[PDB]
Design an enzyme around this catalytic site. Structure first.
Site, short mmCIF file in Angstrom:
data_model
loop_
_atom_site.label_atom_id
_atom_site.label_comp_id
_atom_site.label_asym_id
_atom_site.label_seq_id
_atom_site.Cartn_x
_atom_site.Cartn_y
_atom_site.Cartn_z
N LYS A 219 -12.31 -13.31 105.07
CA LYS A 219 -11.75 -14.46 105.57
C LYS A 219 -10.75 -14.46 106.39
N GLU B 57 0.92 -18.54 98.24
CA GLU B 57 0.25 -17.15 98.29
C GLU B 57 0.95 -16.16 97.27
N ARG B 58 0.05 -15.22 97.15
CA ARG B 58 0.43 -14.49 96.23
C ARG B 58 1.05 -13.42 96.82
#
Lengths: 161, 131, 47, 264, 157, 128
Positions: free
Chosen positions: A5, A31-32
């Site tokens: 993506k 976000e991780r």
């Protein structure tokens, strides 16, 4: 998810931000560390971040989960602030990745409660729209260039109601 | 002209095709239905069908049974129970069957059975015609 | 009425055996289809 | 009510949606085939009528339903059912043969005694000429022969249609003495019969094959019906659902907070 | 909803308008088997009405059962009596529908009134199947049941 | 501690579902707001911060790792419940187990669709 993506996005950056002299800002919202990492190397690797070249075309701004809400909440304004810098100053048509803005939103609501405020039904800060509106309205096209927004957007609860 | 309808439940080969003649293994044995052949109704024998089609063709077939129909109308109907172009029969099988068949005739012992074996034998004969 | 209408014998009875005998004849290739094309899933009852 | 109820609903409908579809495409496959395979047959059976056409024979003395062995994946049977009881009024001797056990099923309407025979499970692994010959053969023998009647079957017509037919069923070589019989000469109460026979077979086969085709399009269709229905129905609920769902949440948040905010 | 829930307590005759009905374009809009008057009586309403109504109420209620069924089961294999009723119910429904007498502006019709007996009778008639070998169409937006028959005729064309 | 000791640990958090309850209970008891689904809002953050502490580290950290198996026990497949949903949005996939199969005896009893390793396929044995 994870289909490349991001990669596609990199490719987009590549196609455009290169092409037209757009730049990029990435706001890693919710976000991780892991995912930001993922990106990190992806960019490193891709050389669309170049830690030796200004072909690092992206400023990464991170407003990840692990932060206090306020930060994540505000990372939205922040990210905007940078791009506006590029936009007006650098004349830019900015690509603004804010990914995933949804979690930002969540954060808004999170605080809403904890701002003693009623958020609303479905949890939602009642100002949800204004928060947004005001945010969105910063993001636009003007006589200064454009801040063009590539926004990762989660289908919340796979619902939209 | 005669419109020849050649079919088996399995296949339609011709459907009222302007064939000049079809010569038929009817239980008549034959009568080789001419475009100027009186309409007539026939039950089909096992033998061969030859489709003299107004086209410089006579096409070869075996049909087992069924009925052929010669309408007043230009149409002839082979309604072949089993309808084959001689093309798909198996000679090898025929002989082999035929010995066997006869053998069974030798052991046939109902009028019907006898009939049947004989039928079968015969069948192999009527196949044998071609084969 | 001779031997395929025997004294009796359906023309069918006959016929089917004829055709069947044809099916028996021919090649095998075809015979795959044969019984396939001459099933008799006709199970029977009087009612 | 609740989402429960709804899902309880949903559950099945969805299931259905699938099921119907399973049943549908399968049916359609069979159907597709059935039709397809119907071509030589079409001719052939059309063939069957060859002279019945050019002169029907009258029986002042052979009703015979033909349906599949199952239905209610359509009202397929009901059509013949109709047409056969309707028939039965008209007729002579009413002894009936039901090819199809969906024929047996309908017939019980003085048609448990007035069956002569019944033939069975011709669908679910197709019927054939082989079968046809079978049903044909034995049928004859029985002091029932022509007693007029019909062969009532589902004549397939188009994907979208079939029209259930009824026939005159005549096999008396005797009135097939009368008329045209002469004209297209070559005749004997042999060859007559041995066509009458054969065309009985041809038809019996044919009709049957139509029947089943009609059903296969009909189950498929039934399954059509359903799935279309299904899909909307689902569609509708799911909102209402959602709504109420949300309704929960909202309310609930209420109930909770501002239902147990500082106010409780 | 509590409010209506309360309301009922005070009520004497409830006219429940049904959006469900309404949407079918129907004016009247009522949910019939909710629109009630407690004073349902073989006495007061006399039994004629009462029963007829109860029969009606019943059939409609029954029909109601069927909606659900057909909804999900299509229709078509039901008792044919049901089939009949379904249609009838619709006639009845339709008959219950009346054009608007003031709102020709809405209707393009005048609306009517049905002296009660012609009404009781009305249902008795439909019930009697007197109309029920007919198209269903005519009953819509009608006044007195006879006229619905009249209306049938014009439609029977 | 292991992670920084270049050591690879697995902590199974059994169950954080129960924590959420406790904590909510805690929050509310503090007569202080919670958040969403009446549960504290930043319990997500809570956990996020907790869970971010599980990671796969580079060499500087001895390469160690802290592998996390948090567990959440669904009540009647109600992940929809915001808090489960929460957890999902953090996780690296979730392993859905389905009872039906279990009861069927089908064990593993997994709901496959819902069992996910988001892209956990960058650490798979070629053999496998």
């Amino acid at each position: 998810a994870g289909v490349g993506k991001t990669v596609l996005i990199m490719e987009l950056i590549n196609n455009v931000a290169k092409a037209h002299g757009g730049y990029s800002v990435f706001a890693g919202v919710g976000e991780r560390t892991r995912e930001g990492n993922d990106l990190y190397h992806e960019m490193i690797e891709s050389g669309v971040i170049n830690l030796k070249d200004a072909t690092s075309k992206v400023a990464l701004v991170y407003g990840q989960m692990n932060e206090p809400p306020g930060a994540r909440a505000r990372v939205a304004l922040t990210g905007l602030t940078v791009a506006e810098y590029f936009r007006d100053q650098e004349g830019q048509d900015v690509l603004l990745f804010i990914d995933n803005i949804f979690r930002f939103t969540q954060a808004g609501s999170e605080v809403s409660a904890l701002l003693g405020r009623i958020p609303s039904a479905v949890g939602y800060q009642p100002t949800l729209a204004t928060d947004m509106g005001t945010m969105q309205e910063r993001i636009t096209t003007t006589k200064k260039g454009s801040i063009t927004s590539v926004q990762a957007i989660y289908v919340p609860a796979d619902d939209l109601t | 002209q005669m419109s020849f309808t050649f079919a088996s439940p399995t296949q339609v080969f011709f459907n009222s095709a302007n064939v000049r003649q079809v010569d038929v293994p009817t239980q008549t044995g034959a009568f080789g239905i001419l475009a100027a052949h009186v309409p007539t109704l026939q039950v089909l024998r096992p033998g061969l069908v030859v489709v003299h089609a107004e086209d410089g063709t006579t096409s070869k077939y075996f049909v087992s049974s069924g009925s052929v129909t010669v309408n007043a109308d230009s149409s002839v109907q082979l309604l072949a129970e089993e309808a084959v172009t001689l093309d798909m029969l198996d000679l090898g099988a025929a002989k082999a069957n035929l010995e066997k068949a006869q053998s069974e005739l030798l052991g046939a012992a109902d009028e019907a059975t006898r009939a049947e074996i004989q039928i079968r034998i015969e069948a192999n004969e009527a196949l044998v015609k071609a084969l | 009425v001779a031997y395929w209408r025997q004294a009796g014998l359906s023309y069918i009875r006959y016929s089917q055996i004829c055709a069947k005998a044809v099916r028996d004849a021919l090649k095998t290739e075809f015979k795959a289809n044969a019984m396939k094309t001459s099933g008799s899933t006709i199970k029977i009852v009087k009612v | 009510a609740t989402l429960k109820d709804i899902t309880r609903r949903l559950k099945s409908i969805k299931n259905i949606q699938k099921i119907t579809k399973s049943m549908k495409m399968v049916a359609a496959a069979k159907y597709a085939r059935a039709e397809r395979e119907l071509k030589p047959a079409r001719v052939y059976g059309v063939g069957s009528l060859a002279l019945y056409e050019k002169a029907d024979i009258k029986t002042p003395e052979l009703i015979i339903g033909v349906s599949s062995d199952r239905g209610l994946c359509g009202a397929i049977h009901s059509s013949v059912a109709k047409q056969m009881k309707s028939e039965a009024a008209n007729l002579k001797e009413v002894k009936i043969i039901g090819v199809g056990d969906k024929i047996r099923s309908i017939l019980h309407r003085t048609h448990s005694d007035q069956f002569l025979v019944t033939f069975k499970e011709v669908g679910r692994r197709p019927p054939t000429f082989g079968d046809a010959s079978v049903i044909a053969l034995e049928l004859l023998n029985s002091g029932y022969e022509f007693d007029e009647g019909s062969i009532i079957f589902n004549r397939f017509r188009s994907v979208i249609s079939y029209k259930t037919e009824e026939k005159p069923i005549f096999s008396l070589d005797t009135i097939s003495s009368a008329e045209s019989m002469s004209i297209y000469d070559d005749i004997d109460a042999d060859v007559l019969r041995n066509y009458q026979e054969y065309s009985l077979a041809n038809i019996i086969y044919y009709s049957l094959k139509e029947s089943t085709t009609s059903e296969q399009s009909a189950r498929m269709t039934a399954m059509d019906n359903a799935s279309k229905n299904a899909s909307e129905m689902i569609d509708k609920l799911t909102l209402t659902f959602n709504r109420t769902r949300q309704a929960v949440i909202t309310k609930e948040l209420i109930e909770i907070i501002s239902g147990a905010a500082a106010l409780d | 909803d509590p409010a209506p829930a309360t309301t009922f307590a005070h009520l004497d005759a409830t006219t429940v308008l049904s959006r469900a009905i309404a949407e079918l374009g129907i004016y009247p809009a009522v949910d019939p088997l909710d629109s009630t008057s407690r004073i349902m009586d073989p006495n007061i309403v006399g039994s004629e009405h009462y029963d007829v109504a109860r029969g009606v109420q019943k059939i409609l209620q029954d029909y109601k059962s069927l909606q659900d069924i057909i909804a999900i089961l299509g229709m078509d294999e039901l008792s044919e009596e049901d089939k009949l009723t379904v249609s009838r119910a619709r006639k009845i429904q339709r008959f219950l529908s009346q054009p608007f007498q003031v709102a020709e502006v809405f209707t393009g019709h005048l609306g009517k009134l049905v002296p009660l007996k012609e009404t009781i009778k009305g249902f008795q008639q439909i019930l009697a199947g007197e109309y029920d070998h007919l198209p269903e169409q005519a009953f819509y937006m009608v006044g007195p049941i006879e006229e619905a028959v009249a209306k049938a005729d014009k439609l029977a064309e | 501690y292991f992670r920084d000791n270049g050591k690879h640990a697995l902590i199974i958090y059994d169950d954080l579902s129960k924590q959420a309850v406790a904590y909510r209970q805690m929050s509310l008891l503090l007569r202080r707001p919670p958040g969403r689904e009446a549960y504290p809002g930043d319990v997500f953050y809570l956990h996020s911060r907790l869970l971010e502490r599980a990671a796969k580290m580079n060499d500087a950290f001895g390469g160690g790792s802290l592998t996390a198996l948090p567990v959440i026990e669904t009540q009647a497949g109600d992940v929809s419940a915001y808090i489960p949903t929460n957890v999902i949005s953090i996780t690296d996939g979730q392993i859905f187990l389905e009872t039906e199969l279990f009861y069927k005896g089908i064990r593993p009893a997994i709901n496959v669709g819902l069992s996910v390793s988001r892209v956990g396929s960058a650490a798979q044995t070629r053999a496998m």
